[PDB]
Design a binder for these strands. Structure first.
Ligand SMILES: Nc1nc2c(ncn2[C@@H]2O[C@H](COP(=O)(O)OP(=O)(O)NP(=O)(O)O)[C@@H](O)[C@H]2O)c(=O)[nH]1
Ligand code: MET
Ligand SMILES: [Mg+2]
Ligand SMILES: [Mg+2]
Lengths: 414, 254
RNA sequence: GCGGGGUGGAGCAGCCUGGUAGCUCGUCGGGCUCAUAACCCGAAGAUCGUCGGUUCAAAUCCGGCCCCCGCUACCA
C-alpha cells in the first residue's frame, strides 16, 4: 500500500467563464472547488478553491490510460500496483473580471499551470489576455494550454482553434506551450493531461535554506455552531509554503494580522503564537514542506481569522524581521494594452493622487500616489504590506468602468 | 386552591369569592379563603350585572353574618368599598401567584394542597408580607431566608425551584482575546469562572458555555430553578468577566 | 434544535377560558345631493392545509401526515 506524501507541487488552473475549470480539477481529482454557498448558487467561480490527488504509473502498460491517480491499474488491464510519483493539487481561479485580482494571489503560489481556452466561445475572449499576462507578470512561463468541452464542437473547428492557439503560443515567452485536447466532464484524454503536467511541468529545485515563510490565503474558525468550551481548537490559516518549512510547536508571528488603535493613530499588531496543527487535505503530517497549500492551526483565536479576514497576510518565524512600510516605492513598467478588455484602449499614464490596486503575493491593497516619477513611484497605502524579499512581484490595476484592470508590473525596492 | 388556618371568615372582613350558582332568592358564591367556603349572597345585599353575576366569575365580597354552631356564613358583594377592595384584590393577586407556585411545586413533588399550605402560608406568615415576598427575599440574599422562617427544607429548595423538572434559560456573551495562547486562555477564563457557583448558589442541574458567532458566544443556566435563572445567569457571565478582566481577555454579555 | 404559517379578493384578528369562522380596505345594490367625492344601510363572498384522537359537542386541545416555509453556514 501507497505512502502518504504531502503535495510537493501546485498547479494553477486558470481560464475564462464556463471553460471547464472546476470540472477540469474534478477530472484530475474527482472533487470540485465551489465551497461557499454563493459559488454554487451562482454557478460561477468567485473565490479560489482546493483539491488533491496522487499519481501512479503502471510500468508494464502502454501510455497513457494506465496513468491513473489511485492505487490501481485496472484501466489498463494490469494487476500491478503502479509506481508512485507524488501527490498533486491545484489553484482553481475565477473567470470573472471583478474577481480577477483573487487568482493573482494564487499566481504567486503555483509551481505550474494548466490554462484553458474555449472552443465554444469567440476567441480570444478578452479576459484570456489578463490570465496570460498574470502568468507573465508573476513569471510562471511553464504552461499547458488545453481546448475544452470538445464534445459539442467538431474536430475541424477544434483544429481551427488549435491553429489559433498554436499561434497564440508563438512570439512570446510561450513559444512551445503545448495543446492536449481534453473535456473536463466526460473524463476524456485526462490521462494524457496528467502525462503533460508531469513531463512539461516539473516541481522546481527547492530551497530549504531561506527563512520559512507561510503565505496566507484562507482561514477558518473550525469551532462549529454549538461548540462547547471543552474541545476548542485554534483558528486555521491555510496557504502554501514556497521557501522553508514548518514544524510542530514552531514559534511564529502573523504579519500584519490584527488592527489595533495605537498612539492617537491607526496601526497594526504583530500576532504571536505557537503552531498546533499542520494539515494537508485529509492526511496528518507533523512537518510542512513546500508544494501545495498547507493549513496550519495554532494557539490563536479564530475570531481574528474566520471568514478570510487576514486575506493574503504573511507569517514568519518569531525570531525574524520583515520590512513593514505604510508607504512603498515601486518600479512599474506599464502594460501595452488593457488585457482583459473587450475594447483594448491605450493605457492612460498614472497621474498624481490617483487610486490604484496592488496584489502582493496574496495580500491586496488600495493606494494613492504621493510622488510621481516616470519609472519610480512612492505610494501611500491604507495598510502596510509585508515585503519579505527584494522587488517582490506585486500586480497592479487601475479601475475601468468599475472593473480594476491591470496597468503594469511593479517592484518594491527595500 | 388555598388552604388557610381557620374555619369561618372574620366578622366584617372583606375578601374575594368565586360565584358558583344563582337561584331565584339568592346566590351560591365560593370564597377562595377557607378551602372554598359556600356563602349565600342574598339579593337583599346586592346592588352589566350579567358580567358580575356570571357563571364562574371571581368577585369581591364582604362577610357580615357568621354562625359557629352549624358552621355557616352570609356574605355581601355590595358592602365592599373602594378603599378596601383595592388592597384586598392586591393581596388576592399575591395569594394567586402563591397558588401558582405552591400548586406547581406540589404537582411536581407529588404532594397535596392541605399540608402544603400548612407548611408555606402559615409557617411563613410569621414573616411579614404576603408569602410571595417570603420567597421574593429568599431569592435575593440567600436561600437561608426560607430556613429562617422555620419551614423544613422540603418546600425550601423545591418550591424555590419551580416558580418562574428542568427549565431552559441562557444568554449570549461576546469575547475577544489577543494573547499568544488565546485559546488556552479563553478556556482559562472559562475554567476559572465556572468554579464554586454550586456552593454560593446551591444545588442546580446543568450549565454549558458555547458559541453562536465567531466572537459571539452562548452560556447556559438550565436547572430546576428558573426563579434562580438570572442569579445563576448574570453573575456567572460576570465570573467570566471578573476573570477575563484579569487575564487579558475581554469578556461581557451581549 | 427541528419548529412555525397553514382560514372570503384580500390583511390579520379569533386559542389557553370549546356551541356565531370576527373587525377593516375591497365587491355589487340602495340611500343622501342639482350631480360627483366623503358619510349611512343591506346582501355575496373562506366554511379554518388535511387524516385522526379528545370532546355530547372544536380555527378554539393536540398528535400523524401534504404544502409553504423558517430563525442558520466548507466544519483545517
Ligand atoms: N459537457 C461539459 N459540460 C461541462 C464541462 N465543464 C463544465 N461543464 C458544465 O458547463 C457549465 C459551465 O462550466 P463550468 O463548470 O462553470 O466551467 P468553469 O470554467 O469552471 N466556470 P467558472 O470558473 O466561471 O465557475 C456547468 O453547468 C458545468 O457543469 C465539460 O468539460 N463538458
Ligand atoms: C483548502 S486549505 C488547503 C489544505 C487544507 N489542509 C485543507 O483541508
Ligand atoms: Mg470555475
Ligand atoms: Mg356619491
Amino acid at each position: 500500500a501507497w505512502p502518504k506524501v504531502q503535495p510537493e507541487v501546485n498547479i494553477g488552473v486558470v481560464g475564462h467563464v464556463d471553460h471547464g475549470k472546476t470540472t477540469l480539477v474534478q477530472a484530475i481529482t474527482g472533487i470540485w472547488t465551489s465551497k461557499h454557498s454563493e459559488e454554487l448558487k451562482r454557478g460561477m467561480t468567485i473565490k479560489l478553491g482546493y483539491a488533491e490527488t496522487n499519481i501512479g504509473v503502471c510500468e508494464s502498460c502502454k501510455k497513457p490510460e494506465a496513468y491513473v491517480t489511485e492505487p490501481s491499474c485496472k484501466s489498463c488491464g494490469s494487476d500491478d500496483e503502479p509506481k508512485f510519483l507524488r501527490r498533486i493539487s491545484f489553484i482553481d481561479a475565477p473567470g470573472h473580471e471583478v474577481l480577477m485580482a483573487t487568482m493573482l494571489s494564487g499566481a504567486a503560489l503555483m509551481d505550474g499551470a494548466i490554462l484553458v481556452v474555449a472552443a465554444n466561445e469567440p476567441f480570444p475572449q478578452p479576459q484570456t489576455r489578463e490570465h496570460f499576462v498574470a502568468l507573465g507578470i508573476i513569471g510562471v512561463k511553464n504552461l499547458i494550454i488545453v481546448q475544452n468541452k470538445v464534445d459539442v464542437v467538431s474536430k475541424e473547428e477544434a483544429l481551427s482553434q488549435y491553429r489559433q492557439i498554436k499561434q497564440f503560443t508563438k512570439g512570446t515567452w510561450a513559444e512551445n506551450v503545448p495543446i492536449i485536447p481534453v473535456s473536463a466532464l466526460h473524463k476524456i484524454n485526462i490521462d494524457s493531461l496528467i502525462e503533460g503536467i508531469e513531463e512539461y511541468i516539473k516541481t522546481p529545485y527547492r530551497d530549504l535554506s531561506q527563512k520559512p515563510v507561510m503565505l496566507v490565503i484562507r482561514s477558518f474558525d473550525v469551532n462549529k455552531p454549538g461548540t462547547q468550551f471543552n474541545e476548542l481548537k485554534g483558528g486555521v490559516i491555510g496557504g502554501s509554503i514556497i521557501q522553508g518549512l514548518f514544524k510542530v510547536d514552531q514559534e511564529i508571528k502573523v504579519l500584519p494580522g490584527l488592527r489595533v488603535e495605537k498612539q492617537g493613530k491607526v496601526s497594526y499588531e504583530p500576532i504571536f503564537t505557537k503552531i498546533s496543527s499542520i494539515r494537508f487535505g485529509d492526511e496528518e503530517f507533523k512537518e510542512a514542506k513546500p508544494g501545495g497549500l498547507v493549513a496550519i492551526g495554532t494557539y490563536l483565536d479564530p475570531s481574528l481569522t474566520k471568514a478570510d479576514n487576514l486575506l493574503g497576510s504573511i507569517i514568519t518565524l518569531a525570531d525574524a524581521e520583515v520590512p513593514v512600510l505604510w508607504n512603498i516605492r515601486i518600479k512599474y513598467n506599464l502594460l501595452e494594452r488593457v488585457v482583459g478588455a473587450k475594447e483594448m484602449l491605450k493605457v492612460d499614464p498614472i497621474r498624481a493622487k490617483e487610486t490604484l490596486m496592488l496584489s502582493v503575493g496574496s495580500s491586496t491593497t488600495l493606494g494613492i500616489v504621493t510622488s510621481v516619477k516616470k519609472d519610480e513611484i512612492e505610494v501611500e497605502l491604507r495598510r502596510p504590506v509585508a515585503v519579505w524579499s527584494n522587488n517582490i512581484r506585486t500586480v497592479i490595476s487601475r479601475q475601468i468602468a468599475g472593473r480594476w484592470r491591470m496597468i503594469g508590473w511593479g517592484l518594491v525596492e527595500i | 386552591m388555598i388552604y388557610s388556618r381557620s374555619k369561618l371568615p372574620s366578622e366584617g372582613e372583606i375578601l374575594i369569592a368565586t360565584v358558583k350558582q344563582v337561584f331565584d332568592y339568592g346566590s351560591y358564591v365560593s370564597l377562595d379563603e377557607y378551602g372554598g367556603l359556600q356563602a349565600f349572597l342574598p339579593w337583599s345585599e346586592v346592588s352589566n350585572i350579567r358580567d358580575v353575576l356570571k357563571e364562574n366569575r371571581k368577585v369581591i365580597v364582604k362577610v357580615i353574618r357568621v354562625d359557629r354552631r352549624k358552621g355557616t356564613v352570609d356574605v355581601s358583594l355590595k358592602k365592599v368599598t373602594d378603599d378596601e377592595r383595592r388592597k384586598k384584590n392586591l393581596q388576592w393577586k399575591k395569594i394567586q401567584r402563591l397558588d401558582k407556585i405552591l400548586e406547581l411545586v406540589s404537582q411536581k413533588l407529588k404532594l397535596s394542597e392541605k399540608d402544603a399550605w400548612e407548611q408555606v402560608a402559615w409557617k411563613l406568615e410569621a414573616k411579614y408580607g404576603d408569602p410571595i415576598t417570603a420567597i421574593e427575599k429568599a431569592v435575593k440574599e440567600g436561600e437561608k431566608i426560607l430556613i429562617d422562617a422555620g419551614v423544613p427544607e422540603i418546600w425550601v429548595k423545591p418550591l424555590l425551584e419551580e416558580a418562574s423538572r428542568k427549565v431552559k434559560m441562557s444568554g449570549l456573551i461576546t469575547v475577544r482575546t489577543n494573547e499568544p495562547l488565546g485559546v488556552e486562555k479563553i478556556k482559562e477564563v472559562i475554567s476559572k469562572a465556572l468554579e464554586n457557583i454550586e456552593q454560593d448558589y446551591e444545588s442546580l442541574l446543568n450549565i454549558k458555555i458555547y458559541t453562536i458567532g465567531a466572537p459571539r458566544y452562548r452560556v447556559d443556566v438550565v436547572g430546576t430553578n428558573p426563579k434562580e435563572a438570572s442569579e445563576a445567569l448574570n453573575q456567572i457571565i460576570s465570573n467570566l468577566i471578573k476573570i477575563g478582566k484579569e487575564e487579558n481577555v475581554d469578556i461581557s454579555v451581549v
